[PDB]
Write a protein that binds this DNA or RNA. Structure first.
Ligand SMILES: [Mg+2]
Length: 152
DNA sequence: GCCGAACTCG
DNA sequence: CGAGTTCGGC
């Protein structure tokens, strides 16, 4: 799809919410992926559930988190697939388990998913500084006006 | 850190 | 009703 449609989807990731507060996991993971691209740490469209992703997620997650949020990178790593541009390369022999899997922890991710990957169009677009700046602003639209002071 | 259970969103 | 979170006993 087009840059317009990605901008729209990055603005509406359907994050978990509770009493007005938005779980920032899906935002922090997309920001971490864009960070990795920017730094040249993610040259191929192949996003492993590894220390490098977890550290980049934690850096962004800590910037956004409230006291109630828990550093659980396995959750957006799985649940971002409802966005339509975030996909899972499923491990050999795991195709049927994957269908009813839950992202209950790291071993559940590692059993089922070899790595995550993007739409090829999105991956190419994110090579572009202007696109990353655009989609970064789009991600902030997931957060309510009332929490912007603590979560932006 | 695991996952069944609980919770809230919509 | 399912999605996407946190909780709690282990
Ligand atoms: Mg909720």
């Amino acid at each position: 799809m087009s840059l317009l449609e990605y901008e729209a989807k990055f603005s509406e990731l359907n994050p978990n919410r509770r009493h007005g507060n938005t779980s920032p996991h899906k935002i922090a993971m997309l920001l971490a992926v864009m960070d990795l691209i920017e730094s040249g740490s993610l040259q191929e469209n192949r996003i492993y559930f590894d220390r490098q992703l977890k550290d980049a997620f934690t850096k962004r997650f800590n910037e956004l988190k409230s006291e109630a949020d828990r550093d659980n990178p396995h959750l957006p790593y799985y649940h971002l697939h409802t966005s339509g541009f975030w996909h899972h390369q499923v491990n050999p022999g795991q195709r049927e388990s994957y269908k009813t899997m839950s992202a209950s922890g790291a071993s559940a991710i590692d059993q089922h998913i070899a790595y995550a990957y993007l739409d090829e169009e999105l991956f190419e677009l994110l090579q572009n500084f202007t696109v990353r700046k655009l989609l970064t602003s789009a991600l902030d639209r997931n957060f309510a006006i009332t929490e912007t002071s603590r979560k932006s």
